[PDB]
Amino acid sequence: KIEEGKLVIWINGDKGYNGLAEVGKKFEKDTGIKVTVEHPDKLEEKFPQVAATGDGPDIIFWAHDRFGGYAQSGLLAEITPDKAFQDKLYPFTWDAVRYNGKLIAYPIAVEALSLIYNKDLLPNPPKTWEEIPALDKELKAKGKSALMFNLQEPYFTWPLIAADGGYAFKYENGKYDIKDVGVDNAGAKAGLTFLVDLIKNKHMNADTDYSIAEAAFNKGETAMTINGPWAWSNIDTSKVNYGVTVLPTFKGQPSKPFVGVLSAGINAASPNKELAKEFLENYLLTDEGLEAVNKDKPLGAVALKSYEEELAKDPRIAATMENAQKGEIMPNIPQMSAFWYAVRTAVINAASGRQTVDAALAAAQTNAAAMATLEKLMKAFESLKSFQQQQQQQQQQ
Amino acid sequence: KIEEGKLVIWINGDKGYNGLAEVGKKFEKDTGIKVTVEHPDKLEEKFPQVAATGDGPDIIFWAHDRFGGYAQSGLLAEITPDKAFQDKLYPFTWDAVRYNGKLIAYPIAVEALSLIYNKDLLPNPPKTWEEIPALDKELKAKGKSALMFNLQEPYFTWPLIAADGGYAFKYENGKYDIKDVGVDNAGAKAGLTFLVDLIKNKHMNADTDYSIAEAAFNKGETAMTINGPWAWSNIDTSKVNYGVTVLPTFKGQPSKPFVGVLSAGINAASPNKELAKEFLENYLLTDEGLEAVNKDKPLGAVALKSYEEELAKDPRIAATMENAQKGEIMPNIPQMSAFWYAVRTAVINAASGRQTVDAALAAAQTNAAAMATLEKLMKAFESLKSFQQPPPPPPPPPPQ
Amino acid sequence: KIEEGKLVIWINGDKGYNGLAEVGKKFEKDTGIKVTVEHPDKLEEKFPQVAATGDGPDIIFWAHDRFGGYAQSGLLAEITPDKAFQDKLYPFTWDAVRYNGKLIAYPIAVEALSLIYNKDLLPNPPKTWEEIPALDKELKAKGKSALMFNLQEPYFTWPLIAADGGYAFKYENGKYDIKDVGVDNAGAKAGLTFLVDLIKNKHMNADTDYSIAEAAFNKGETAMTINGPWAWSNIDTSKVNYGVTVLPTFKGQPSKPFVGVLSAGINAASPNKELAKEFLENYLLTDEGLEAVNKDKPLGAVALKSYEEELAKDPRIAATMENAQKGEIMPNIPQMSAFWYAVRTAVINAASGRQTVDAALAAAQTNAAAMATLEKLMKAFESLKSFQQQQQQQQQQQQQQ
Ligand SMILES: [Ca+2]
Ligand SMILES: [Ca+2]
Ligand SMILES: [Ca+2]
Ligand SMILES: [Ca+2]
Ligand SMILES: [Ca+2]
Ligand SMILES: [Ca+2]
Ligand SMILES: [Ca+2]
Ligand SMILES: [Ca+2]
Ligand SMILES: [Ca+2]
Ligand SMILES: [Zn+2]
Ligand SMILES: [Zn+2]
Ligand SMILES: [Zn+2]
Ligand SMILES: [Zn+2]
Ligand SMILES: [Zn+2]
């Protein structure tokens, strides 16, 4: 059971739940219905457990990528907003919340990687990657460096690789093509090669992770870094006079960073579908709804569309939205588990000298068609595990 | 060495073989060629073992589903009956004996699930599933159950789940689509939802297996049950006044049971292809042939139109055919094995409460895909080893 | 790290590397560029190990089939010959060197099976396969046989299986179809029936391999054998008066044996790509280039038209070329590994009577799919999980060692 009447909501700890409950109070003054906002620990792991048994929250707030696997299990119900409501949110944020063609959640907040620069050492950030080598030699002569960001992660290095033409899976007609992997193409090729060049030319260090790079920017040792909204707090406390802006273009093409849309999904087994429907649409996805959640903990950029235009006064946020629009939306499929492991090695192999661009990229393509496609076969290890649970609980109890 | 100049036929022991031999005796008089009718134990296991080597019978009689794997291993030869003789049989039976878009056997007899009811407790059977909630409460007043059938098996529950639009695999233009599974669509969902509700409204028991149901019906405790023609014999002994009829409809759609067509196939190694074709086309699949087999032991509903309109005079046989023309033919492909296991769990989990209708059905489609490609793994490791196991050890943290 | 300003060519020791070196030092006097021709052991397995790390030769010479796996790993750079140069070579040789719809190597030599016969025992060799029954019992009267070739290996028996319609995969519009197999079709069926009928009519023996076949023709016991140009050296030794010709036809259709094209690709990591394209186009792939390679160790049938029409004076070489033009180019895809193993059992099980024609070829079409995919799986993880654990062991020494 999931209690017919009260709307129980599950949101992550680090989000503005008090600002959400503040909205949940204005709901119960209107149609009377009591709202309980719980923030359970490891809820992205508890939800797939209790929801399967027909329990859990009415509404779940989490990053869209994880909703795919939920929608695969039939844990989420198809939402029903009209063409009128669908337009007061950003067109692209609707592609983030679709599975098999059905819409399975409402978009809330967008999050993308942005260029972060020290105004003191560089009052005018570079619009092209091409000029970064030349810029470094200008700064090295003064002891500083041009750019420092996490090279160990594909999430950070992908924007450059993807820039010219690289992509995870082809998204066309509101659906994902798992037999169309663009990690090997001419765009990803020249992309990685350029990164590899900036490494052997001695402009970036192959061993740089997240800690080394953030510390360097928060020390004033580097003029630029690539990072998202989460880092902004630390950069305040170090008191570095910094600005956030659009990502540098490569070959005359904008960098395409991955998009992280926070979304609200309705439980399939919830009996209060028309109440959640009323909750999220009429109230939360208006200025007054979001403004309440924002004041508790900032959401960054938002899907509505009236309200972000108001927030867009802060350049930092307007820079997140602008990067989010030019980027590709992080695919919500189980084959995305693969792509990550394929590219993480490909970027690390190529950057160290172990393999070449051509080689390490073409190797990754085979490794994707290995991982998540065989890991798919290891799903039957749980199907055939039920034989274990059956052979004990049908025989006896 | 099948001795070029004779026909040796394999048919199961329970089946009316003495009748087949009579038609083999008739065949002999006319052509001068001796026909043998043999019934070895587990012939459906022995056949592919000897047919492979180029040994065994010229004609093997068995349920069409098993012919899927035979056709695969090329043990069966393509039949070439002209269009004239095709219209002699029912259209939907020709879809049962078709592999890779090719005809690989002759249809003989149709077996399908039906609604069997106690004429005394219920002189008029419901024509809708939706009515069974009401009908139970009326009979629970006289100390009787309305409906009791095997709920442990998908074979029995499927007629209700498929009724709204669910399907095993998609069949169009003589071909099955192994990527088009209709287990989790809109139809199957509301189907299982109804079957689940009848349980949580206490109209049925989640624990009811085959035995319980047949015992509950045979002693006169329950009014109705779902079962095939194999069960009639026992009900006679129990002297309960029963009748067989078409399954109840759900949302104005007929129930879709599985159809097991008994068929005769010609061996690919057989040197007497033309004599077999002469025997099955001109002597067995006629009024005079099938009547003789049926006179030994009943075939039930037959694929031949002229003789079916004669057996249908018994209400029970006409009901099985009625239910058949409304059912989906059981797929003879190997992916069918996966379908069973996935659905068997799905129904059991939904019927116990473990998982919801929406989740259990979606998860069965991930099971049907995973278990099906994992069967290739077992079969590759098996047939690679016979050319000269788990391989498990998959290994992260990366969150901080 | 491949050494800029100079060339380094790899070719197998068995081939005319000294002939190639002559063309090497020809290119020197004319452009002032040092061309080193090395011939190292198991180079066909060493190349993907050094080219992966961005090292090795500039040009590699090997049979095209192995390039598919090289092109997969991206080790070979796309070649750009214009349509003017392309027409110098036979059209079919361009299909042997194509991956993902891209040309990745320059075709040098062509290799195929041919019908070899004894002109003493049999002056006029049979045109069709169907007349080999009638011919066998004639020679059996003298105390000889008509034909004996290696039945153990599909590479040998395939010309007959494929003759009526069978194919490995469907090559159309510059790419192969891994889901279109022609192993159990009505052509392959009748093909293999005929081979088996010859076995159970006692015209051939099911236990015959390469050694049996070669030694039996080399001692004049059999009138015919099917073998390629590599065998010729041994038949020149045996002093047997022998002829090479086009393969017999089956049901009016010519036998389609497999084609092996020796070809030269350019390394992806090579900095001298326009020099490699200079040496291979203007110097080597001309008759004066191939005249020198051929003089060292004969290449057999050459891809270049002009020089081919000169070598065809040898009736043996002329026949080898004809059988290639009738043949299908051996698919360079990784699924090919399976095809062999599937068809290897099919032919052996069909010859031994352990299975019928129909039954044996139908297992091959299932085995080929079952192996290739589920073997291609395993190989991915072996070469991933063994390099995943190798990763943390470095980290253990970056702080300890
Ligand atoms: Ca509205
Ligand atoms: Ca400056
Ligand atoms: Ca406001
Ligand atoms: Ca886009
Ligand atoms: Ca008569
Ligand atoms: Ca009544
Ligand atoms: Ca009569
Ligand atoms: Ca030219
Ligand atoms: Ca000359
Ligand atoms: Zn909490
Ligand atoms: Zn530089
Ligand atoms: Zn009720
Ligand atoms: Zn050597
Ligand atoms: Zn003969």
Q: Which residue numbers of B have CB closer than 8 Å to A's CBs? A: 184, 341-342, 345, 353-356, 358-359, 361-363, 366-367, 370-371, 373-374, 377, 392, 394
B vs C: CB pairs below 8 A: 57
Q: Which residues, 6+ apart, have CB-to-CB distance to B250 below 8 Å? A: B128, B129, B130, B160, B163, B164, B191, B194
Of C74, C377, C380, the CB nearest to A361: C74
Q: Do A73 and B362 touch (CB under 8 A)?
A: yes
Which has the closest alpha carbon to B7: B284, B287, B303, B304? Answer: B284
Q: What are phi and psi of B68, to 5 degrees?
A: -60, -55
Compute the distance between CA of residue A381 and CA of residue A376 in angstroms, rounded to an integer: 10
| Beta carbons of C204 and C347 less than 8 angstroms apart | no
Cβ pair B73:C184 closer than 8 A? no
Which of A75, A379, A383 has the CB atom closest to B359's CB atom? A75
Residue B271 CA to ligand 5 centre (angstroms): 24
**3.30.479.30, 3.40.190.10, 3.20.10.10, 3.40.50.360: CATH of A112-257+332-397:** 3.40.190.10
Compute the distance between CA of residue C289 and CA of residue C310 in angstroms, rounded to an integer.
14
Looking at residue B283, what DSSP letter applies? I
- Give the CATH H-level superfamily of domain B112-257+332-400: Periplasmic binding protein-like II (3.40.190.10)
Environment class of B239 (CB within 10 Å of its CB; exposed 0-12, middle 13-18, buried 19+): exposed
**Residue recorded with tokens 């394999």:** B10
Question: How far apart (Å, rounded) are the C-alpha atoms in residues B153 and B161?
Answer: 12
Picking from C355, C370, C374, the nearest residue to B53 by CB comes out as: C355
Distance from CA of B371 to the nearest CA of A (A): 6
Q: How was this structure determined?
A: X-ray
List chain C residues with CB under 8 Å of A378. none
Cβ within 8 Å, pair C367-B377: no
Per the CB < 8 A criterion, the answer to whether C102 and C67 are in contact is: no
Q: Measured between beta carbons, which residues in chain B are less than 8 angstroms from residue A384?
A: 371, 374
* Residues in chain B closer than 8 A to C341 (CB atoms): 387
- Residues with Cβ within 8 Å of residue A4, at least 6 apart in sequence: A271, A272
Q: Which residue of C has its CA nearest to B77?
A: C358
> Nearest by CB to A386, which of B345, B362, B392?
B345
Query: What is the rounded CA–CA span in Å between residue A21 and residue C296?
Result: 88
Residue B62 · residue B43 · CB < 8 Å: yes
Q: Residue C147 C-alpha to ligand 14 middle, in angstroms? A: 13
Closest CA to A222 of A150, A314, A277, A319: A150
Which residues, in sequence order, are CB contacts of A228 under 8 Å at separation 6+? Answer: A111, A112, A113, A114, A320
DSSP per residue, C352-380:
SSSS-HHHHHHHHHHHHHHHHHHHHHHHH
Ligand nearest to the CA of C311: 9
Residue ranges of alpha helices (H) inside chain A are 17-28, 43-50, 67-72, 83-87, 132-140, 154-164, 186-200, 210-217, 232-237, 273-278, 287-296, 307-311, 315-326, 336-352, 357-368, 371-374, 380-383, 386-393
Alpha carbon distances (Å) from B314 to A237, B112, B319, C248: 91, 16, 9, 66
Chain B residues touching residue C373 (CB < 8 angstroms): 376
| A45, A60, B117, C318 from B253: Cα distances, Å | 40, 37, 21, 72
Distance CA(A360)–CA(B273), nearest Å, equals 58
In angstroms, the CA B336 to CA B356 distance is: 24
* DSSP, res C284: I
Q: What is the DSSP string of B237-282?
A: HTT--EEEEPPPBBTTB----EEEEEEEEEBSS-TTHHHHHHHIII
Of B353, B371, B377, the CB nearest to A383: B371
Token digits of residue B219: 């002693």
How many angstroms is it from B196 CA to the middle of ligand 12?
12
Residue with tokens 């939904």: B350
Amino acid identity of residue A65, one-letter, is D
The neighbour count for residue C274, using CB atoms within 10 Å, is 10
- Could you tell me if A259 and A111 are in contact, meaning their C-beta atoms sit under 8 angstroms apart? yes
Nearest CA in chain A to B345: A386
Which CATH number describes the domain made up of C112-257+332-401? Answer: 3.40.190.10
Contacts for B370 with CB less than 8 Å, ≥ 6 apart: A376, A377, A379, A380, A383
Give the end-to-end CA distance of chain C in Å, rounded to a whole number: 28
φ, ψ (nearest 5 deg) of residue C393: -70, -30
> Which phi and psi angles does C182 have, rounded to 5°?
-125, 55
Residues of A in contact with C380 (CB under 8 A): 366-367, 369-371, 374
Residue C101 is given by DSSP the state T
* Spatial distance between the Cα atoms of B351 and B198, rounded to a whole number of angstroms: 10
Considering only CB atoms, which chain B residues are within 8 Å of C348? none
Q: What is the CA radius of gyration of chain B?
A: 23
Distance from CA of C385 to the nearest CA of B (A): 8
Neighbours of chain A (3+ CB pairs under 8 A): B, C
How far is Cα A31 from Cα A27, in angstroms, rounded to an integer?
6
Element (H, E) at A244: strand A242-245
Which residues fall within 8 angstroms of residue A183, CB to CB, at 6 or more apart?
Answer: A166, A167, A168, A339, A342, A343, A346, A361, A364, A365, A368
Nearest partner of C368 among B332, B379, B70, judged by Cα:
B379
DSSP result, A273-336? HHHHHHIIIIIITSHHHHHHHHHHS---EES-SSHHHHHTTSHHHHHHHHHHHHSEE---STTH
Q: Given an 8 Å threshold on Cβ–Cβ distance, is B383 in contact with C362?
A: no
Q: A250 C-alpha to center of ligand 2: Å?
A: 21
Q: Of the candidates C72, C269, C377, which has its C-beta nearest A362's C-beta?
A: C72
Name the residue among B61, B59, B56, B36 with its Cα closest to residue B46: B56
Q: How far is the CA of A309 from the centre of ligand 13 (A)?
A: 72
Query: Do C263 and C106 contact (CB within 8 A), yes or no?
Result: yes
Sort out which chain A residues have CB atoms less than 8 A from C75's CB and list them.
358-359
C1-111+258-331 and C112-257+332-401: same fold?
A: yes
Phi, psi of A284 (to 5 degrees): -60, -40
Q: Which residue(s) pair with A227 in the sheet?
A: A114
The residue ranges of every structural domain in chain B are: 1-111+258-331, 112-257+332-400
- Using CA atoms, how far apart are residues C236 and C22, in angstroms rounded to an integer? 28
DSSP class per residue in C290-351: HHHHHHHS--SEESBHHHHHHHTTSHHHHHHHHHHHHSEE---STTHHHHHHHHHHHHHHHH
Chosen for mutation from A189, A352, A358 (greatest number of chain C CBs closer than 10 Å) is A358
Alpha carbon distance B299, B93 (integer Å)? 15
Task: Give Dmax over CA atoms of chain A in angstroms.
Answer: 78
Question: Which residue in C338, C322, C339, C348 sits closest to C378, CA to CA?
Answer: C338
CA dihedral A372, A376, A377, A381 (to 10 degrees): 120
In angstroms, the CA B71 to CA B98 distance is 9
CATH of A1-111+258-331, one of 3.40.50.2300, 3.90.380.10, 3.30.450.20, 3.40.190.10: 3.40.190.10
User: Does B395 sit within 8 Å of C362, measured CB to CB?
Assistant: no
Kindly provide the resolution of this structure in angstroms, with one decimal: 3.7
How many whole angstroms separate alpha carbon C301 and alpha carbon C376?
A: 34
Within 8 A of C359 by CB-CB distance, chain B residues are 51-52, 54, 73-75, 268-269
CA dihedral for B233, B238, B243, B246, sign (positive or negative): negative
> Which two three-digit tokens encode residue C14?
């068995």
Whether B174 contacts B92, CB under 8 Å: no
And the tokens for A63? 């990053």
> Of A194, A230, A15, whose CA–CA distance to A116 is shortest?
A230
Beta strands in A82-129 (DSSP E): 98-99, 102-103, 106-110, 114-118
Residues after which a C–N gap over 2.5 Å breaks chain C: none
- How far does residue C134's CA lie from ligand 14's centre (Å)? 7
CA distances from C21 to B169, C10, C100, C261 (A): 63, 11, 32, 21
* C-alpha A203 to ligand 11 mean position (Å): 7
Please answer whether residues A299 and A89 qualify as being in contact, where contact means their C-beta atoms are separated by less than 8 angstroms: no
Between CA B335 and CA B374 the distance in angstroms is: 11
Interface of chain A toward chain C, CB-CB under 8 angstroms: 184, 353-356, 358-359, 361-363, 366-367, 369-371, 374
Q: Do C74 and A362 touch (CB under 8 A)?
A: yes
**Do A359 and C384 count as a contact with CB atoms less than 8 A apart?**
no
Contacts of B220 (CB under 8 A, 6+ apart): B118, B120, B121, B240
DSSP code per residue over B162-214 = HHTT-EEEEEETTEEEEEEEESSSHHHHHHHHHHHHHHHTTSS-TT--HHHHH
φ and ψ of B74, to 5 deg = 60, 15
Nearest CA in chain A to C398: A207
Residue B179's DSSP bridge partners are none
Chain A residues closer than 8 Å to B374 by CB: 377, 380, 384
Radius of gyration of chain C (CA): 23
Q: What are phi and psi of C332, to 5 degrees?
A: -85, 5
Cβ distance C52 to A356 less than 8 Å, yes or no, reads yes
Chain breaks in chain A (C to N over 2.5 A) after: none
